[PDB]
From a paper:
Here, we investigated the biochemical, structural, and dynamic properties of the enzyme complex responsible for vitamin B6 (pyridoxal 5-phosphate, PLP) biosynthesis in S. aureus, which comprises enzymes SaPdx1 and SaPdx2. A multimeric assembly of two enzymes, Pdx1 and Pdx2, synthesizes pyridoxal 5-phosphate (PLP), the active form of vitamin B6, as well as its vitamers.
However, all the structures revealed the same quaternary arrangement and structural features. The dodecamer forms a cylindrical quaternary structure with an opening diameter of approximately 52 Å and a lateral height of approximately 84 Å. Each monomer is folded as a slightly distorted eight-stranded TIM-barrel with the top of the barrel pointing toward the internal aperture of the cylindrical quaternary structure.
Author numbering:
A (entry chain A), E (entry chain D): 5 to 277
B (entry chain E), D (entry chain E): 7 to 50, 54 to 275
C (entry chain B): 7 to 54, 59 to 276
């Protein structure tokens, strides 16, 4: 169901961009006006999710369409891992992407969605080439570091991006007759690995996500080789989300303009661990 | 006589059974479209104490407020609790691990009763022993009172996987499969000749939203139990109708999406 | 070009392949009814460092018979297999019976034009060998022991997990594949094919007509035999006995008839 | 170009570098005789949270209040944080484990920068890897923010002991010394031909009293870092001058005794 | 750099050929006659060193001299690991290379020779990039797999060669700011590993050694990325050493001529474990 070309093709249009977890119209248009290339709709931002605890389910559909009605950029929404019904509901709503998101308390602790049997594209989280390849093999069209969401600490996301990238590059120059047992050893589908090698990188875009709290943070992920940046708590849990948003957008676009980043950097206190 | 008992269980297939605490709740359930109600004293309770059966005044009040079948819970292995409810004329007893067990080693001989029983399970071994004792209905154990669907998903997947694997198992391997999972070897041979369970297996344990109940039907259940999900929530009567409609129309994603418009539990 | 490699392998479905060490054993094999022969220097039994056979021994067996010839090569030994392929053998057996040359990596059999056969013991090893381009599988068994039990375990083990897979949920095959070490793509094909997309022969320990019949009863697509034939009294009758027993594995009166020789392997 | 960088580091030898939080502090430091200042947002902080680099307004304010070199900290491995400070024109960046690391496996490639770096260490292995990455300065890690000198004593003793032991090590034993301590084998051969470290190694971590700073100089340091010791204390400007004077006149025990007249930290 | 260029240059001159363990002039002539690019003087071939056991020291200098007189191809001799004066004596005899061979009883179990302070070039054993880098940093000009000498079993040489090449190739595409941690993790000199990346491969030739018993064996190591082949027990503990020799040489240089290797191989009777 669907096409890989179409799903992956669309996700690539956000390359270089910043995506913003938002909770209402106001946050949504703030996201759009500040330069976000897509929004992510949710009921409460990952910082409040770990605080509130409880069971984190998908958002009320009322919330999602109120955001879709606020913005001209693509709207993403989260669904619980394996929650077949939540994804189908979101997809019928016509969201541009669903995030099978480990930020939400799962519904299935052993099996993820068969995302190839959907038409809406899916973004899936990961921490290494084995997880990336299982999600890709399930039909994911976009990848992002799992990171450590809601902590404003970038280190975990740095670790994951570094690990996926390292394993991928190792595979791109790996002996053909060593790939099967490489795949065995990391728990990855042999043919996805064989694709990845021939493509010379991942066949989907791999964003950074979790603990981006400062412009330098975002520019750092791009320096580390991310295809783009998610950020939710870091922006709206700050003294001026409007300024923080435009700072993180410019910093991600000009991640090597070090004096623009320092200039931009003059704002105020932000999220903490 | 198992044909009678199981056959009355099947008349619930596809429906929603709701835990109810008094008569308002009882017919709020019935008005909203429930196929049955569970009479109980505290919805899943994790307050504390010892959970025994309801007072019979509470069961009787519930049977006297609706025409859809009424079930009630008894502690595991509590011979007189089950016999008392059976004399009251409930339609089903649930020998329910939601209540403090009275016997921690041996369940009731439900074949030596005339009222049909529903018992919980988590895998084919528990489902086969409860069937062998004479259960006429099965439900996942799940994780009641938590509003988290994940454990019921795990149990539905485990029961169904082992069932479906048994349906195509070599004849001469079923004995030592039965040894390995702890199951009556004849109940397993029955399950193979039937290609599914001889009883209906409902989901139960933390159904909180319309999409929850629908997910369970998508996953292969025959129906849905729901208790805390409804009344522990903002405007329950609306929650009731939505969960009933989602459980019947569980692939109508536009309908489920609309239905989802309210404010959940926790 | 995998359909053509796998299609030739099916030409032996139902037959008996025989380890022969020279022209006259190769002729005995063909006379008795072998569908193919395995050229090799020391039979699996009295093997117990083992490299490929001298090419001279191999071509002698090609020269003696008109049914296809296979020869073994050490696991992962690129130039042993390349030499064999360029001598024109019909199949190469990347065989664990020989001392492995690469303990971590097998050959990329898809990058060859001669079709390959590999051993396995479970759906995991099977899928990985198929993923590398094996065209035909055999149980690893316990070669040279005249004892069938390991081949029985391997056959039963492969067939159970295949069966489990033909009815396994779609959204579970990835976690299955991870848990058993299998290429996910191959398991989805096995499901769609309803069986393994290559033929799986029983190998290792077949010592009597009854053994060859048992393996076929158990689901195999054919039998490999080596030791139990020539390390017995009158190998020529032992061959004809086993060949007939394999094609008529449910003609039990014939097998008992046929079972009328003397001493055997181990 | 390492000669340039390290040579500007040496112009601090014998002095005191002070953590400062705004401009008053900054020139209180300079008035009292500091050789350099560390710009930071919270003096060692053990309050909590995530410690990132200072806001550039805070760094700029500090550089605009003194003429002695200004340093600032960046999280370990935070490529853009270091690049940002480098564009601001600080004199040194400290890749500082006092701040929450941004990379927990890999430190910055400091040779690919033009501003000199100071990095922490606890032994010759950490000192040799930081040097090999391009550090132009070393400081003990110690135990910052605790006012306890003991961990910096331990680290100075360990670095110096291993250095001095390396200076007289047999040529043909340095490789497997380098393996054992985790160090670049060329950096170790350099250290031997030089008879000491090629950079200056300052003490840092809980200098609270004049006798503390002097003890570090007695122990073989090239200088003293101090942050909490000064401003977290009764009348800091007096503490400042006393620690500057004790670090220069570190064997003048009558002078240190007089200087010690005030009231410490905790 | 400098006299390393010369040392390494001279070892490269045997790239593609076969070096042969010989023990007297007649064996040494067979080697040269059959096409060897070099010979290795020793007193027992690794098969007998294993069976006799005892203490295996350098060869008696007559045996070496007898061998250098008998041939015009370079002569190598073995010395115990870390035996300073065994190497110095061999150097003064004018051998062309010394093998600091772990096939001999190590005289030093903790510290190898400082090879950069000799003028004769050295070949060293290894099993992974850590050992390789440490031998290079000590001044080796040539590497070889440690294999499992005397066993006639190629599997160990295959593992060592596959590991080295895997770690090398992974290094050639490895991030600059990760080579420190990589070097630490494997026990390698950080600067040698930065070299290996720059040159895009090992800066010295790395031969296969230990267990070559048939032409197919030798050809396989060439197939695996070896720069050349050592062989000792495999020849002279076989039916016809002279025919085994030329067949090995031919098969090493034409290691993708499967028609030829097959032809060559049809003269057998070999060694085993
Ligand atoms: Cl996020
Ligand atoms: Cl009873
Ligand atoms: Cl219930
Ligand atoms: Cl066999
Ligand atoms: Cl860098
Ligand atoms: Cl400090
Ligand atoms: Cl050797
Ligand atoms: Mg900032
Ligand atoms: Mg809801
Ligand atoms: Mg004091």
């Amino acid at each position: 169901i669907g096409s890989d070309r179409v799903k992956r093709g669309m996700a690539e249009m956000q390359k270089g961009g910043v995506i913003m977890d938002v909770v209402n119209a106001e946050q949504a248009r703030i996201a759009e006006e500040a330069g976000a290339v897509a929004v992510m709709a949710l009921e409460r931002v990952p910082s409040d999710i770990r605080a509130a605890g409880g069971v984190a389910r998908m958002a009320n559909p009322k919330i999602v369409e109120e955001v879709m009605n606020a913005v001209s950029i693509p709207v993403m929404a989260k669904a619980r891992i394996g929650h077949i019904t939540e994804a189908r509901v979101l997809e019928a709503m016509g969201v541009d992407y669903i995030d099978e998101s480990e930020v939400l308390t799962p519904a299935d602790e052993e099996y993820h969605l068969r995302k190839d049997q959907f038409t809406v594209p899916f973004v899936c989280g990961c921490r290494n080439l084995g997880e990336a390849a299982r999600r890709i093999g399930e039909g994911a069209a976009m990848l992002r570091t799992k990171g450590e969401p809601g902590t404003g600490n970038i280190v975990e996301a740095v670790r994951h991006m570094r690990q996926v990238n390292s394993e991928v590059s190792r595979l791109t120059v790996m002996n053909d007759d060593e790939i099967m047992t490489f795949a065995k050893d990391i728990g990855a589908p042999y043919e996805i690995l064989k694709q990845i090698k021939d493509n010379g990188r991942l066949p989907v875009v791999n964003f950074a996500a979790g603990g981006v709290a400062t412009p330098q943070d975002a520019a750092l992920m791009m320096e580390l080789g991310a295809d783009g940046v998610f950020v939710g708590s870091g922006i709206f849990k700050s003294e001026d989300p409007e300024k923080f948003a435009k700072a993180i957008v410019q910093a991600t676009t000009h991640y090597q303009d070090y004096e623009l980043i320092g200039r931009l950097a003059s704002e105020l206190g932000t999220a903490m661990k």
